[PDB]
Design a binder for this molecule. Structure first.
Ligand code: HEM
Ligand SMILES: CC1(C)[C@H]2CC(=O)[C@]1(C)C[C@H]2O
Ligand SMILES: [K+]
Length: 406
């Protein structure tokens, strides 16, 4: 990991060379590898020299404080490294208020609770279909056989995209969150745009009721959304639809495959699933992005200079022992589940109703049919970090005679 030379305004004792794309002991799990930032030795604000050099807030309180302070911590450059944050132009995420407010309203229209409730029957049926089909085999590669097809196919149906384009779209979205290096962020962004611009154009000529039609034919400030804004908005929805829930589901199922007491609780008390969903979202939070400083700022005794970037990992607040006692322990009866998994401040995630509904459906439908399962013997479940953290592969095994037709 290359280290950028230490800027002169940054003092030595705050330096902690954390690589957000390669955190230390990832074999303990990516959330526990990020939590090394909250170890005993570690200041609450640190400078890392990796990825061009940037600050990191490591505590839930400072993360929330920064997220509620867009006048100082701007969304104009929200990704590390700078080159990616500079090329990030998705809408509404790259706008500060009040400008982002009306775009947020358009985006919210296509993935909001009215749309989730409209899709619920599609969501239920595809999840049951996927889990039937594999129920009698006694094994699966969960990432490939459920975690990817279930949320992506729902998102493609909501956006009206053939699905068939999934391999290409999935590969581009991955490039922007956990890059492999064969493309810059801008190169993946520009390929996503070449895909989207003709569909947007096609859909102003022949509108359907899908999400891309509704955006391209939308309005901000009483005037038509432009072609330029429509593709930056549609692009954002495509990266969240393809690379968030997908990764999160694998984390949960890996947890449940090692935790029979937790499985039984959700089978015997199905009304507990929504609360367990919240506690799995805290424990297996997976997003981390950042902000750029609009001005010099003395932040809890540390001088941040105009143009510094600061990583404010959304996943860290709920792993913070100051927010949740015994934070690595999953407790479905936790009296207060404190987290910022879906963000904080004016950018709080718009697709979170879709995500919760997909997570709850996975939990209920998988456990109604495959109540007993395990990680394959001698399998290594390998994690991966980035803007969105993930799981490489999750081989599960189970006895088909202990499954259930429903
Ligand atoms: C477990 C699943 C998900 C998690 C943890 C998650 C996380 C987040 C986080 C942390 C942010 C704030 C980023 C920032 O402050 O810069 C955000 C924003 C956003 N997310 Fe999600 N997301 C998930 C699923 C989805 C899905 C499926 C969609 C569907 C399109 C989506 C759409 C959006 C949008 C549109 C925004 C921008 C809101 C704004 O900037 O005003 N998310 N998400
Ligand atoms: C940070 C996000 C999770 C959020 C904004 C992004 O770029 C994401 C990676 C997808 C979208 O939902
Ligand atoms: K920008």
């Amino acid at each position: 990991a290359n280290l950028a030379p230490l800027p002169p305004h940054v003092p030595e004792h705050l330096v902690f060379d954390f690589d957000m794309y390669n955190p230390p002991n990832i074999s303990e799990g990516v959330q526990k590898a990020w939590a090394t930032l909250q170890g005993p030795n570690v200041p609450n604000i640190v400078w890392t020299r990796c990825n061009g050099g940037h600050w990191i807030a490591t505590r839930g309180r400072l993360i929330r404080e920064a997220f509620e302070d867009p006048a100082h911590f701007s969304s104009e450059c929200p990704f590390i490294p700078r080159e990616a944050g500079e090329a990030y132009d998705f809408i509404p995420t790259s706008m500060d208020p009040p400008e982002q407010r009306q775009f947020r309203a358009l985006a919210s229209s296509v993935v909001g609770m009215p749309v989730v409730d409209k899709m619920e029957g599609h969501i239920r049926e595809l999840a049951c279909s996927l889990i039937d089909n594999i129920r009698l085999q006694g094994h699966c590669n969960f990432t490939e056989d459920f975690a990817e097809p279930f949320p992506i196919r729902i998102f493609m149906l909501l956006a009206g995209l053939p699905d068939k384009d999934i391999p290409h779209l999935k590969y581009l979205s991955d490039q922007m969150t956990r890059p492999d290096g064969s493309m810059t962020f801008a190169e993946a962004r520009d390929a996503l745009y070449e895909y989207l611009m003709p569909i947007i154009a096609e859909r102003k000529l022949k509108p359907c009721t899908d999400a891309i039609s509704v955006i391209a034919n939308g309005q901000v400030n009483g005037r038509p959304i432009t072609s330029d804004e429509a593709k930056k908005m549609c692009g954002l929805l495509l990266v969240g639809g393809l690379d968030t829930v997908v990764n999160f589901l694998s984390f949960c199922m890996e947890f449940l495959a090692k935790s029979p007491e937790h499985r039984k609780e959700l089978i015997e008390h199905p009304e507990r699933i929504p609360a367990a969903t919240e506690e799995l979202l805290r424990r297996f939070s997976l997003v981390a992005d950042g902000r750029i400083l609009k001005s010099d700022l003395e932040f809890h005794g540390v001088l941040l200079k105009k143009g510094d970037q600061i990583l404010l990992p959304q996943l860290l607040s709920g792993l913070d022992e100051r927010e949740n006692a015994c934070p690595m322990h999953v407790d479905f009866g936790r009296q207060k589940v404190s987290h910022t998994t879906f963000g904080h401040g004016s950018h709080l995630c718009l697709g979170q109703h879709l995500a919760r509904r997909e997570i709850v459906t996975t939990l209920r439908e998988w456990l109604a049919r495959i109540p007993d399962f395990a990680i394959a013997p001698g399998a290594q479940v390998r994690h991966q970090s980035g803007i969105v953290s993930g799981v490489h592969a999750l081989p599960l095994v189970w006895d088909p005679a202990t499954t259930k037709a429903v």
